[PDB]
Design an enzyme around this catalytic site. Sequence first.
Site, PDB file in Angstrom:
ATOM      1  N   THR A 239      50.948 -18.105  17.422  1.00 40.06           N
ATOM      2  CA  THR A 239      50.742 -19.604  17.938  1.00 40.06           C
ATOM      3  C   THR A 239      50.826 -19.686  19.383  1.00 40.06           C
ATOM      4  O   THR A 239      49.964 -20.411  20.146  1.00 40.06           O
ATOM      5  CB  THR A 239      51.479 -20.462  16.756  1.00 40.06           C
ATOM      6  OG1 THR A 239      51.386 -20.235  15.680  1.00 40.06           O
ATOM      7  CG2 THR A 239      51.004 -22.026  17.119  1.00 40.06           C
ATOM      8  N   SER A 282      48.720 -24.542  14.552  1.00 36.58           N
ATOM      9  CA  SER A 282      49.603 -24.211  13.363  1.00 36.58           C
ATOM     10  C   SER A 282      49.205 -25.347  12.397  1.00 36.58           C
ATOM     11  O   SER A 282      50.029 -26.353  12.404  1.00 36.58           O
ATOM     12  CB  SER A 282      50.967 -23.928  13.483  1.00 36.58           C
ATOM     13  OG  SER A 282      51.833 -23.710  12.197  1.00 36.58           O
TER      14      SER A 282
HETATM   15  C1  HEM Z   1      53.384 -23.848  20.920  1.00 31.13           C
HETATM   16  C2  HEM Z   1      53.853 -22.872  19.829  1.00 31.13           C
HETATM   17  C3  HEM Z   1      54.438 -23.307  18.624  1.00 31.13           C
HETATM   18  C4  HEM Z   1      53.794 -24.418  17.870  1.00 31.13           C
HETATM   19  C5  HEM Z   1      52.624 -25.302  18.132  1.00 31.13           C
HETATM   20  C6  HEM Z   1      54.890 -24.177  16.558  1.00 31.13           C
HETATM   21  C7  HEM Z   1      54.242 -25.006  15.374  1.00 31.13           C
HETATM   22  C8  HEM Z   1      55.244 -25.034  14.174  1.00 31.13           C
HETATM   23  C9  HEM Z   1      54.890 -25.962  13.046  1.00 31.13           C
HETATM   24  C10 HEM Z   1      53.687 -26.757  12.729  1.00 31.13           C
HETATM   25  C11 HEM Z   1      55.996 -25.604  12.036  1.00 31.13           C
HETATM   26  C12 HEM Z   1      55.983 -26.173  10.624  1.00 31.13           C
HETATM   27  C13 HEM Z   1      57.227 -27.044  10.784  1.00 31.13           C
HETATM   28  C14 HEM Z   1      57.351 -28.060   9.460  1.00 31.13           C
HETATM   29  O1  HEM Z   1      57.448 -27.339   8.508  1.00 31.13           O
HETATM   30  O2  HEM Z   1      57.038 -29.318   9.524  1.00 31.13           O
HETATM   31  C15 HEM Z   1      56.868 -24.520  12.770  1.00 31.13           C
HETATM   32  C16 HEM Z   1      57.863 -23.969  12.083  1.00 31.13           C
HETATM   33  C17 HEM Z   1      58.681 -23.156  12.701  1.00 31.13           C
HETATM   34  N1  HEM Z   1      58.665 -22.474  13.676  1.00 31.13           N
HETATM   35 FE1  HEM Z   1      57.100 -22.729  15.211  1.00 31.13          FE
HETATM   36  N2  HEM Z   1      55.747 -23.377  16.565  1.00 31.13           N
HETATM   37  C18 HEM Z   1      55.689 -22.910  17.866  1.00 31.13           C
HETATM   38  C19 HEM Z   1      56.411 -21.852  18.490  1.00 31.13           C
HETATM   39  C20 HEM Z   1      57.525 -21.293  17.578  1.00 31.13           C
HETATM   40  C21 HEM Z   1      58.219 -20.165  18.338  1.00 31.13           C
HETATM   41  C22 HEM Z   1      58.453 -19.832  19.749  1.00 31.13           C
HETATM   42  C23 HEM Z   1      59.224 -19.675  17.242  1.00 31.13           C
HETATM   43  C24 HEM Z   1      60.270 -18.865  17.478  1.00 31.13           C
HETATM   44  C25 HEM Z   1      61.042 -18.760  18.518  1.00 31.13           C
HETATM   45  C26 HEM Z   1      58.883 -20.782  16.142  1.00 31.13           C
HETATM   46  C27 HEM Z   1      59.955 -20.705  15.027  1.00 31.13           C
HETATM   47  C28 HEM Z   1      59.460 -21.660  13.974  1.00 31.13           C
HETATM   48  C29 HEM Z   1      60.425 -21.553  12.729  1.00 31.13           C
HETATM   49  C30 HEM Z   1      61.388 -20.293  12.520  1.00 31.13           C
HETATM   50  C31 HEM Z   1      59.669 -22.417  11.865  1.00 31.13           C
HETATM   51  C32 HEM Z   1      60.434 -22.845  10.646  1.00 31.13           C
HETATM   52  C33 HEM Z   1      61.188 -23.992  10.930  1.00 31.13           C
HETATM   53  C34 HEM Z   1      61.857 -24.544   9.450  1.00 31.13           C
HETATM   54  O3  HEM Z   1      61.074 -24.259   8.347  1.00 31.13           O
HETATM   55  O4  HEM Z   1      63.119 -24.956   9.303  1.00 31.13           O
HETATM   56  N3  HEM Z   1      58.028 -21.610  16.505  1.00 31.13           N
HETATM   57  N4  HEM Z   1      56.414 -24.348  14.198  1.00 31.13           N
END
Ligand code: HEM
Length: 399
Positions: A239, A282
Site C-alpha cells: 500500500t 486499501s
Molecule cells: C499509506 C499507507 C498505508 C495505508 C493507506 C494503510 C491503510 C490501512 C487500513 C485501511 C487498515 C484497516 C484499518 C481498520 O481495520 O479499520 C490498515 C490496517 C493495518 N495496517 Fe495499514 N496502512 C498503511 C501503511 C501501513 C504500514 C507501513 C504498516 C506497517 C508498519 C501497516 C500496518 C497495518 C496493520 C498491522 C493493520 C491492522 C491493524 C489492526 O487490525 O489492529 N499499515 N492499514
Amino acid sequence: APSFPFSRASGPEPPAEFAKLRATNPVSQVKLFDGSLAWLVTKHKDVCFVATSEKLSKVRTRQGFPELSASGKQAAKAKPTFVDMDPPEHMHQRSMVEPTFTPEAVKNLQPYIQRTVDDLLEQMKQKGCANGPVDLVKEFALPVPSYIIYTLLGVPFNDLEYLTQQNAIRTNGSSTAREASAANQELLDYLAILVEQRLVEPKDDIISKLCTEQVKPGNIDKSDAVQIAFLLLVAGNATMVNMIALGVATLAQHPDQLAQLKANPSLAPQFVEELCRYHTASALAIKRTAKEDVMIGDKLVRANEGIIASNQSANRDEEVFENPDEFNMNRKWPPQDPLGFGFGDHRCIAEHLAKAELTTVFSTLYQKFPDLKVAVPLGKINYTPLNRDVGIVDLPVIF
Ligand code: HEM
C-alpha cells in the site's frame, strides 16, 4: 445483487458503483466469488459505525465472514494475529508492538526517515537516467517503505535489498502462484532466524522487543513473534508503495498543484492528507460479520451476515467532503476524519509512520529533482488490475 469487489472505472478512478449507491442505496447486498452475500456500506457515517460497532466481529472463523477470494478462505484457517481479533485479545497483542508507532515515536523517527529518503534519492540520482528513463517504483517507491519497516523490525542493512525484492515478488502481479508463495515462505523462514538470534542477543528493534517482553516471559511463542513481525511487514508495504507512486502521478496530473508543492514543500502534510483520501489504496479491509442483529440505515443486518464497509466510498462521500472527486491539496477539511487508514480500534497501527514517510517523500522528492517528469503519457500509466486495490505497477520517470 452485483458481483463484488467492483472494478475501478478507470486506472486511477474508484469503482463507478459507489457514487450511485451512496445516492440511491447506501446499504445494499453484493454477491461474493463463492456466491455468498454480504452487506456493502458506502456512506461515511455508516462506514464509521461498522468500524466501531461492538456488535460486529473480525474473527474469520465466524460463518458469514466476507472472504473476497479463494485464497482468502484458505488463509482464514491459520492461527490469527491481532489484525483478525476482537477485544480484548486484539489490544492484548496489538499493544505488544504499538510503541514504535506512537505519534511521539514517529516524530523522533523523522530524521531517520529523512536520511533513508535522502540516500535513496541520491543513489537514484547518481544512477542517473542519461540513457533513458528509470522506474520510480523499483528505484524509489518500493525501497522507501521496505527499508524502513525492515530496519524497524530488525533486519540488518546488507539484507535489505534482497528482502525488499522478495517481498515485492510476494504481491507482484506478474508472479506465478508458485513464485509468490516461495517468496512468502522464504520471508517467514528469514524472520524465524532473526527471532532465534534476537532471543540470544537482543538488539534495538521490534523483533527483539517481542522476544524479550513476550516470548521469554512465555506470553507468546516463537512462531507467534514471527507471525506478528510478518504481519507488520506485509500489512502495509504494498500500500505504501502504491501511495507514493499514485502521489507522483497525481501531481503530474495536476501541474498547478505540483507547482505549488515545489514552491512550498511545507504543504506536503496537506497534500498527503488529500492523497490518502482521494486514493484509498486499501479499501477492502473494513470487513465484519454481525454477532447479533444490527440496524444500519434502513436495513437490518442479521446475526451471521457479513459486512463490507468501503472506506474508499466514504472518502468520496459528497455529504462529508465537498467536491469529493476533485483532488485539492488546499481542500478545506470537515470535522469528519478521512478514512484512508480505517477507523476505530483496528485503525492502521502505522498511520502516523505512513503519513511521516509520505510527508517526507513529497517534501523532498521535488527538492531533489525539481524537473522530475513521468517519462510516458499519463494515460498510458501501468496501473494495478481494475478489480484490485488502486495502485501503480511501474512508473517511468526522468529528472
Ligand atoms: C499509506 C499507507 C498505508 C495505508 C493507506 C494503510 C491503510 C490501512 C487500513 C485501511 C487498515 C484497516 C484499518 C481498520 O481495520 O479499520 C490498515 C490496517 C493495518 N495496517 Fe495499514 N496502512 C498503511 C501503511 C501501513 C504500514 C507501513 C504498516 C506497517 C508498519 C501497516 C500496518 C497495518 C496493520 C498491522 C493493520 C491492522 C491493524 C489492526 O487490525 O489492529 N499499515 N492499514
